Design an enzyme around this catalytic site. Structure first.
Site, PDB file in Angstrom:
ATOM      1  N   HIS A 208      35.530  43.347  30.151  1.00  0.00           N
ATOM      2  CA  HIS A 208      36.698  42.887  30.880  1.00  0.00           C
ATOM      3  C   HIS A 208      36.363  41.523  31.452  1.00  0.00           C
ATOM      4  CE1 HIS A 208      34.102  44.774  33.904  1.00  0.00           C
ATOM      5  NE2 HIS A 208      34.518  43.784  34.678  1.00  0.00           N
TER       6      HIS A 208
ATOM      7  N   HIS B 139      32.543  40.287  31.623  1.00  0.00           N
ATOM      8  CA  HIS B 139      31.547  41.317  31.910  1.00  0.00           C
ATOM      9  C   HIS B 139      31.530  42.282  30.747  1.00  0.00           C
ATOM     10  CE1 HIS B 139      31.854  40.575  36.486  1.00  0.00           C
ATOM     11  NE2 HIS B 139      31.080  39.707  35.860  1.00  0.00           N
TER      12      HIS B 139
ATOM     13  N   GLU C 291      33.037  35.423  39.371  1.00  0.00           N
ATOM     14  CA  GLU C 291      32.467  36.184  40.479  1.00  0.00           C
ATOM     15  C   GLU C 291      31.109  35.614  40.870  1.00  0.00           C
ATOM     16  OE1 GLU C 291      33.087  40.437  39.307  1.00  0.00           O
ATOM     17  OE2 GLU C 291      34.626  40.165  40.835  1.00  0.00           O
TER      18      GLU C 291
ATOM     19  N   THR D 291      31.058  45.119  40.882  1.00  0.00           N
ATOM     20  CA  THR D 291      31.758  44.163  41.737  1.00  0.00           C
ATOM     21  C   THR D 291      33.127  44.653  42.170  1.00  0.00           C
ATOM     22  OG1 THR D 291      32.797  42.914  39.936  1.00  0.00           O
ATOM     23  CG2 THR D 291      30.547  42.249  40.613  1.00  0.00           C
TER      24      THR D 291
ATOM     25  N   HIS E  99      43.623  46.266  37.794  1.00  0.00           N
ATOM     26  CA  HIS E  99      42.694  45.324  38.419  1.00  0.00           C
ATOM     27  C   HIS E  99      42.182  44.298  37.412  1.00  0.00           C
ATOM     28  CE1 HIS E  99      42.688  47.814  42.031  1.00  0.00           C
ATOM     29  NE2 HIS E  99      42.483  48.863  41.255  1.00  0.00           N
TER      30      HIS E  99
ATOM     31  N   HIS F 121      37.223  38.627  34.858  1.00  0.00           N
ATOM     32  CA  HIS F 121      37.770  38.239  36.147  1.00  0.00           C
ATOM     33  C   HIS F 121      38.188  36.780  36.041  1.00  0.00           C
ATOM     34  CE1 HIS F 121      35.875  41.844  37.998  1.00  0.00           C
ATOM     35  NE2 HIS F 121      34.991  41.643  37.041  1.00  0.00           N
TER      36      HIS F 121
HETATM   37 ZN   LIG Z   1      33.613  42.906  36.225  1.00  0.00          ZN
END
Ligand SMILES: [Zn+2]
Ligand SMILES: C[C@@H](c1ccc([N+](=O)[O-])cc1)n1c(=O)oc2ccc(S(N)(=O)=O)cc21
Length: 257
Positions: A91, A116, A103, A195, A61, A93
């Site tokens: 990590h 994050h 996000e 999230t 992911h 996104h």
């Molecule tokens: Zn995250």
């Protein structure tokens, strides 16, 4: 199982994780004009000088850079937080295009990516216990825009070839996360959630006002990762972001006017 595709993406998550429709879900849009300056908010204390990175992992992911959290080596304190939160992993996104990927949004603006840095409250003993608590986690969120390169990100970029597919891990010692921070630690804060599933409502979100800039080549290398495992059909790891969720009965607070 859950992911970011047409048939398993964020609009489907509530069927396995009903808290997806809960009262303090993340991310959210940060409406800068309605956020409230809180002078009682303390400056953030980011103490990363003793950080011990261990490894980097493609989990299907995102990719996580994991740290030794068995001692107070890299900790977040202050701001809205009570107690000491230990860094466990960071990590990102990111998007398939520079105009999307974050996000959180700021006045509905999407950034190219969002970092994050995940910390857990040491009073709960371990991360698994902390995620079960309303004040268990503190996530420091940092927006990425495309512009000049971020030198402190390059060591991450250069190892991504070793973890292209889901389940791959590589040693990743001596990485200094201070090289990912912007100049200012001004922030917005609100109570929210993970999230990604299980979407637990355990996070004090601290989102920095100042984005970091990364180069087009740096973000392009994120987009060459794969959601799939080796030997499965290739699907590029892009657009691994959840869209903004309703703010409901929450007020976003700002550390700055
Ligand atoms: Zn995250
Ligand atoms: C949810 C998660 C579940 C499963 C995986 N996984 O390995 O596939 C990763 C994250 N998850 C977790 O377990 O610990 C987390 C810490 C932070 C965030 S985030 N995006 O809010 O900062 C999500 C998760």
């Amino acid at each position: 199982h859950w992911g970011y595709g047409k048939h398993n993406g964020p609009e489907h998550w509530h069927k396995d994780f009903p808290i997806a429709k809960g009262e303090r879900q993340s991310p959210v849009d940060i409406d800068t004009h309605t956020a409230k300056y809180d002078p009682s908010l303390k400056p953030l204390s980011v103490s990363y000088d003793q950080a011990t990175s261990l490894r980097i992992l493609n989990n299907g992911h995102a990719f996580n850079v994991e740290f030794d959290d068995s001692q107070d080596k890299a900790v977040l304190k202050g701001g809205p937080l009570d107690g000491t939160y230990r860094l466990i992993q960071f990590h990102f996104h990111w998007g398939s295009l520079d105009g999307q990927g974050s996000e959180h949004t700021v006045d509905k603006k999407k950034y190219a990516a969002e970092l994050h840095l995940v910390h857990w409250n040491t009073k709960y003993g371990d991360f698994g216990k902390a995620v079960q608590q309303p004040d268990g986690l503190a996530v420091l969120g940092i927006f990425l825009k495309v512009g000049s390169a971020k030198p402190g990100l390059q060591k991450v970029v250069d190892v991504l070839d070793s973890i292209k597919t889901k389940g791959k891990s590589a040693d990743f010692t001596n990485f200094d996360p201070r090289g990912l921070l912007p100049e200012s630690l001004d922030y917005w804060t609100y109570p929210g959630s993970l999230t990604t599933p299980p979407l637990l409502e355990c996070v004090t979100w601290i989102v920095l006002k100042e984005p970091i800039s990364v180069s087009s080549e740096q973000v392009l290398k994120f987009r060459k990762l794969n959601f799939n495992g080796e030997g499965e059909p290739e699907e590029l790891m892009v657009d691994n972001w959840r869209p903004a969720q309703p703010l409901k009965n929450r007020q976003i607070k700002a550390s700055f006017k």
